[PDB]
Structures are given as C-alpha cells and as structure tokens.
C-alpha cells in the first residue's frame, strides 16, 4: 500500500516532532501573527482527516461533520488521527482515486497529492517551531 | 505542460518570499543549529536543479559538477530548472535511474524534488514571518 506508506513517510516524522512539544510550548508562536504550536499541529491532523474522508465520500458533505474532538494532548490527538486517516486511506480504491469530486471538481487523487503537499508544508513550519524550543537532533524530513 | 505548472505554483512563492529577505536578514537564523536565511534559500534552488539534471541525463553524473544576491540566484535558478522541466519527456519520466546501490524512476526522483521545495518552504514561511513580514502569500499558487 503505496497510499498510506507514502502518508506515514511523512505522518511519522510529524507525530515524533509533536512529542518534542513540551506543555507550556503548546502555546508558543514564532511570531505574533503566528499558530500556536498546537494550533499548528492540530492543523495539520484535522485537515488531513478531512481530505480523506472527502476522497472517501466523493461528496463535500465531511464539512457538514462538526466533529467536537475533546481531546487536548497533542500526543493523543496526533495517535489518533494518524490510526483515523490510516484506516481510510487503507481501504481507498482506485475507482475512489479516480473518480471526480464535486465540491462548491477535483479527482480524489489530485486532492489526496494536495493533502500530501499541505502535510508536507505545515511539518516544514513545525521543524522550525521545534527547532526554536530548544531541540537540536531532529529526525529527517521524511522516512524512507 | 504540468510538470512546469506544478513546480512553479510552489516556486513562485518561494521567490517571492525570498524578495521579503534584505540584506541585513541574509545571516539570520532561528536557532543556533538553523540554516542563515540565505543557506535555506540557496539550498531549495541549488537542489531542485540538482535533481532536474539526474532527471535529464539518467545518469548521477550531475552531482560531480558566483551571484551572492538571493533575487538574482532564485531568478536564474528558476529559469534554468525550467527549461529543464520543460524539456523532460514521458520516456524520461519512466526510465529509472541507476554510486546509490538502489534505482529510481525519473518520475520518483521528480516528486521527491518537489516534496524537498515545499518542506523547505515550509521552513521559509517561518523565516520571513520572523523577520517582520506578515502580509505572506498563500503557500501554493492555484495555477
Ligand atoms: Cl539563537
């Protein structure tokens, strides 16, 4: 399963630098105009889990689903939504990949490589983010 | 052309960021063990070109082969990953690519340069956020 290896390549270096994330960093923002490092990190974890339920659905209708998530430890929140988006992607077939998605029109592949592109952009923020908390050995960008 | 498009709707924006850097920011970075602004931003445009040409000649022969200004070098540097872009054909973009001990389709080694351009950015969003600059634009175009 290229789909959810080619995620978790990603997904995984994302989910390790959420750990280094202390507590009282949660709040912490480079700049004033900046997210939070939580905001960030639960940023990148909801609208993943989006993404894939719209490529899932071939409908906008995922963004009807307010789904209040209680949850406010990143490292719980960043566990179970990886398992979440796994799981979808997991079960994602071709038809689901190239079929076109009618939203307020795109393939559910163009938007899986879109949802791949924002992962990859916000986990380039929060090596920074991370980076300016005091930790120096950061995993690569990328699993293999 | 889609390749051209693509990479462009990111490197647009890394150029134009890299317009928000002066010249007193060049030496700035965000942490001790950080890339000076000017390292990150040499380094998204000296490696994208890297790839475009083990791409173009299906050969690692690029890796053995003077501008200081960062406006100037990703203005050159743009264009000639461009061209190169450009020219790649469907039969390029297939062949894999044997120095690695491993084999990589051109098509491969073209995502993966893509991917390395939108992390990197991902780090000069924060870089120039830092230095003063809050009016940024959205990180991909829509091309
Ligand atoms: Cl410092």
Excluded at 8 to 28: C, P, Q, W
Excluded at 72 to 79: I, Q
């Amino acid at each position: 399963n290229q789909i959810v290896s080619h995620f978790l390549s990603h997904r995984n270096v994302t989910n390790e630098l959420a750990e280094k994330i202390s507590k009282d960093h949660y709040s912490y923002k480079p700049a004033e105009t900046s997210m939070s490092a939580e905001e960030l990190v639960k940023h990148i974890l909801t609208s993943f889990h989006l993404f894939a339920n719209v490529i899932k659905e071939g409908n906008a209708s995922p963004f009807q689903n307010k789904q209040e998530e209680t949850e406010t430890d990143l490292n719980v929140l960043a566990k179970t939504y990886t398992e979440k988006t796994v799981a979808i992607l997991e079960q994602l077939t071709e038809e689901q990949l190239d079929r076109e998605i009618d939203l307020t029109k795109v393939t559910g592949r163009a938007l899986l490589q879109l949802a791949m592109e924002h992962e990859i952009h916000h986990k380039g923020n929060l090596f920074v983010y991370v980076r300016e908390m005091g930790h120096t050995e950061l995993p690569f960008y990328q699993q293999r």
